[PDB]
Amino acid sequence: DSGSETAFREIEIGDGFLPVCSLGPGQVGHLNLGQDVSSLRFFAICGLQEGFEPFAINMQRPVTTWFSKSLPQFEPVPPEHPHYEVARMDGTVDTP
């Protein structure tokens, strides 16, 4: 909106970055990672010139992805849960 080309600025590297996409209901998206630049369209238009390596350029095997399963699973309660706490009391003569 201000006219700057870069979307986000001053981004710390931190742990790292990964390709990601969240599709809504009834949505179809083609996640074209750079397995082959021939499949990568518009790359020479924007990205081959500017100095951006395609993601997984030399990666022989296809890139492995992870999807939100959306299946309720019973997992241990995190100790740092902002709302829920589990406390262990034992050894009382009457209370087990």
Binding site: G3, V37, S38, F42, A44, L48, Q49, E53, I57, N58
Partner: protein
């Protein structure tokens, strides 16, 4: 938030301390600054009680309200997202309804008190920021709970003076007994079944008998407050009487939370305010015996926090719901939710002071026509309007233009959409301001810039589609008469040019220009500009073309505004006035929408060519501009074309190009009538070529100053240009500019190497040459910006050798600019002088802070240069760049490049070079002729020099 309660109590006590007496001015300033910083860093959620205290005290508008209203404006400006934005603000969230009614009643009270008070410089100067801040903070689509509503001395109504009539006194007694029964019933629901004797479970009311057995001696003292409440209810203008004919456990529960008729609920809320009046009267009699002071409930009920108000309203609505379940009606109005919106109430205020303002401009016009009469009965109104109302509506419309322009269908506002009623009301308000300033520029001479600024703001954000289609005939006729009066005014000016003269001069016609710009922006021209509006605008464009034909000094200096408004009306006009032979197939034509009888009575001769004969068809103006470009006349030789007609073309042709048969029609039935405009992409390309030809022909003429505005006008016509236009015109123009700039940099280098007073004089001469050079670049290059950005991909994929040649030319231009420090400072000076940064920003959004040449060469076309050069050449680019860092000249670095040609990169060296080579040879336009070493060294040297100057610019 953990300690919000005593934080708020500390806020209240600091308010009391700043309102303390026997304090030195420095001490009061210290406490006020403490309040400033404290409320600035305290979250608005706990500031509600302090804001209530402000809403009580500051409408008095005493000299002692300075810090309260300053706190008002600071807090509201800070929390304008906390209030106005319907979505929860990411910092502190949404605003409570209590705070909403607080700021609404605050705005109302401040405005009415400032209205009734005499003008004072300090008071008005510091109060208008507060009022505009409150207006911006308050959500205009917010609806108050009770639009119809009524230290503090609350006056109760004459409860005992108004004797209760016997037509309902039985019902008064019945409801008193019924409130006692409701006490008993609440106990029963709490499981304390009411016992006749003293009952342990009856904690609130130990002895509690049915009214048959309860003694009337104590029944009277229990029921006296309800008696007084109902006597008050009939003491007001309300009339309570049995709806049905007639007149200790009321199992039907009374639910004060339910909603009834609006007038009935509002009068119940006013009864709650009367309960407040009685309670606050007795409590202030008690409190003044304790030493005075104000109590939170004792503050006015409307300004009171919505929780004590909630309790008092709960009591009053319990009474009211008793009435409507036991058959009693109250009759005192019918305020719609539109009127409950604060925007519509603000508009009612605006129109009431608008009729007051037309009255006072009438009497001040009467007193200035009769010599000079300083004494004015409405001078208070004059000062109040000028110092408060004009900036208030200015800032209000500026920060709520998105909502007001929002339609029920076209909801582009962040929050809600403007109602149709308020939409037409504010359109007619804008018409009323037009009549206010109609031939009335001598008055409000000092306020005229603010008047015209607010006129532009009000002209923007007018959804006149609602007014024209399903809208009031009154406001539609008001705007039509405004357009007609403006057009006949233009006729009077054109006849005179061959007081309304001072009116048009003080205007400079910019409000109409902004109006057609907004109409073109939202495509209002389909319906808003029609019939009489179309005819008036057509005779107006004919008359301003007559002004363009005339060549006096006044019209020569007026041609900027005339051309700008002509282009705006061309982009906001409904029918093809150019080549209008097909207007009868155009459905928007005045003749097609009008009967022949109506054309006869309106004077329309059934021919656009006939009632606008001064301006011929676009084919004829194209032949004219092509002949002018071929002849290469000076800018001052015939300035009317480029001043007026060329902006008109660069606005009309891009707008009507989509309608043209060359462009894809939306549908076959839609395109079944032949389009009135038959322009083509070839037509727009030829017009762009004509503009570029006249620019290159007037490049050396120092009187060619308006080429900057020509470029701004021709930004839209750059799009959809033919690729062949590059080699046809852009290469000669850029090449001539490059050659001239090379001559200038050679002269500048000579003048900088010689040290002498005449050398400094020659350096000043080349400074002037650099300034006119910057003018030439700002006339030439903005077209090239959109050209290269629109056809970047085509020249990127297909290797246009002409595009690479023009890359080399613009690279040489960049080299001259980088090695000329004089050119850089003249660039910045020309930018600040001619406001070039605004045009650069506009081109950036619609493809000194930043350099247009830097954007043109170092950013836009450096990528196509970098793909013209090979990646194996990019393996020598850093070596050539480091040689340029060692400051070796171009021929010299070519020598070491030829000597070092054998260290070119290899595919097997790294996998990156492998796929880079693969893509580079897989480009279909690649040929083996690039393997020639001479071409390689040329391109390596060029790209490395460009990158070296770019990195020097990036890191000074």
């Amino acid at each position: 938030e953990h300690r919000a309660i005593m934080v708020d109590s500390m806020l209240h006590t600091v308010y009391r301390l700043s309102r303390g007496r026997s304090l030195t001015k420095a001490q009061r300033d210290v406490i006020e600054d403490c309040l400033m910083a404290l409320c600035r860093y305290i979250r608005p959620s706990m500031l509600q009680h302090l804001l209530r205290r402000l809403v009580f005290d500051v409408p008095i508008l005493n000299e002692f309200a300075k810090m309260p209203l300053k706190l008002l404006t600071n807090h509201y400006e800070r929390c304008w997202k906390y209030y106005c934005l319907p979505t929860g603000w990411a910092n502190f969230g949404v605003t409570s309804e209590e705070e909403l009614h607080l700021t609404r009643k605050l705005f109302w009270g401040i405005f009415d008190s400032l209205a009734h008070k005499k003008y004072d410089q300090e008071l008005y100067r510091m109060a208008m920021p507060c009022l505009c801040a409150i207006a911006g903070a308050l959500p205009p689509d917010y609806v108050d709970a009770s639009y119809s509503s009524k230290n503090f001395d609350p006056r109760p109504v004459e409860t005992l003076n108004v004797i209760i009539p016997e037509k309902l006194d039985s019902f008064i007694n019945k409801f008193a007994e019924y409130t006692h029964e409701k006490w008993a019933f609440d106990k029963i629901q709490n499981n304390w079944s009411y016992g006749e004797n003293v009952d342990e479970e009856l904690k609130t009311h130990p002895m509690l008998r049915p009214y048959k057995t309860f003694s009337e001696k104590d029944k009277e003292i229990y029921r006296w407050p309800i008696k007084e409440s109902l006597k008050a209810m009939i003491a007001w203008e309300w009339t309570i009487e049995k709806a049905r004919e007639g007149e200790y456990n009321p199992q039907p529960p009374d639910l004060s939370g339910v909603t009834l008729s609006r007038e009935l609920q509002a009068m119940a809320e006013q009864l709650a305010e009367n309960y407040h009046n009685t309670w606050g009267r007795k409590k202030k009699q008690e409190l003044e015996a304790k030493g005075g002071g104000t109590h939170p409930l004792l503050v006015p009920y409307d300004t009171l926090t919505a929780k004590e108000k909630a309790r008092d309203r709960e009591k009053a609505q319990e009474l009211l719901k008793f009435l409507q379940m036991n058959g009693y009606a109250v009759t005192r109005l019918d305020t719609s939710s539109i009127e409950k919106r604060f925007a519509f109430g603000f508009l009612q205020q605006l129109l009431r002071w608008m009729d007051i303002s037309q009255e006072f401009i009438a009497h001040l016009e009467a007193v200035v026509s009769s010599g000079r009469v300083e004494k004015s009965p409405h001078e208070q109104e004059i000062k109040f309007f000028a110092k408060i109302l004009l900036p208030l509506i200015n800032q209000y419309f500026t920060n709520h233009c998105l909502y007001f322009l929002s339609t029920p269908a076209k909801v582009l506002g962040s929050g809600g959409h403007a109602s149709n009623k308020e939409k037409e009301m504010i359109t007619s308000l804008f018409c009323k301001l037009a009549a206010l300033v109609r031939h009335r520029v001598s008055l409000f001479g000092t306020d005229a810039p603010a008047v015209v600024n607010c006129l532009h703001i009000l002209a923007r954000s007018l959804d006149a589609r609602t007014v024209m289609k399903s809208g009031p005939e009154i406001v539609k006729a008001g705007l039509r008469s405004f357009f007609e009066s403006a057009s006949e005014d233009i006729e009077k000016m054109v006849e005179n040019l061959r007081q309304n003269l001072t009116y048009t001069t003080v205007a400079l016609l910019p409000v109409l220009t902004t109006l057609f710009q907004h109409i073109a922006q939202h495509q209002f021209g389909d319906d808003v500009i029609l019939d009489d509006v179309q005819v008036s605008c057509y005779r107006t464009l004919c008359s301003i073309y007559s002004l363009g034909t005339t060549k006096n000094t006044y019209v020569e200096k007026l041609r900027p505004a005339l051309g700008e408004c002509l282009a705006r009306l061309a982009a906001a006009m409904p029918v093809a006035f150019l080549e209008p032979q097909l207007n009868e197939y155009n459905a928007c034509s005045v003749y097609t929408t009008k009967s022949p009888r109506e054309r006869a009575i309106l004077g329309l001769p059934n021919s656009v060519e006939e009632m606008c004969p001064d301006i011929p068809v676009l084919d004829r103006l194209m032949a004219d501009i092509g002949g002018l470009a071929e002849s290469g006349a000076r800018y001052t030789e015939m300035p009317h074309v480029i001043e007026i007609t060329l902006p008109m073309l660069c606005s009309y042709l891009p707008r009507w190009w989509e309608r043209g048969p060359e462009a894809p029609p939306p549908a076959l039935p839609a395109g079944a009538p032949p389009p009135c405009t038959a322009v083509t992409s070839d037509h727009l390309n030829s017009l762009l070529g004509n503009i570029l030809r006249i620019i290159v022909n007037n490049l050396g003429i120092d009187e060619a100053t308006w080429m900057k505005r020509l470029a701004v006008f021709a930004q839209p016509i750059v799009s959809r240009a033919r690729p062949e236009l590059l080699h046809s015109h852009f290469i000669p123009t850029i090449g001539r500019l490059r050659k001239r700039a090379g001559k200038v940099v050679a002269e500048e280098e000579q003048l900088r190497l010689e040290a002498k007073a005449e050398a400094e004089e020659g350096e000043l001469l080349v400074r002037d040459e650099f300034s006119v050079l910057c003018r030439d670049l700002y006339a030439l290059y903005p077209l090239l910006i959109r050209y290269v950005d629109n056809n970047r991909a085509h020249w990127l994929t297909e290797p246009n050798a002409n595009a690479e040649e023009l890359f080399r030319m613009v690279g040489e231009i960049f080299i001259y600019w980088s090695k000329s420090h004089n050119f850089k400072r003249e660039e910045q000076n020309f930018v600040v002088q001619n406001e070039i940064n605004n045009m650069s920003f506009l081109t950036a959004d619609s493809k000194s802070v930043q350099t247009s040449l830097i954007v043109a060469t170092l950013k836009k076309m450096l990528p196509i240069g970098l793909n013209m050069c090979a990646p194996t050449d990019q393996d020598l680019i850093m070596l050539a760049k480091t040689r340029y860092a060692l400051k070796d000249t171009d021929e010299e670095v070519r020598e070491f490049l030829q000597n070092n040609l054998h260290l070119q990169g290899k595919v097997e060296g790294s996998p990156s070079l492998r796929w880079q080579m693969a893509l580079y040879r897989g480009l279909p336009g690649r040929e083996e002729d690039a393997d020639d070493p001479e071409k390689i060294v040329r391109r390596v040297q060029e790209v490395s020099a460009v990158l070296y100057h770019l990195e020097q610019t990036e890191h000074p």
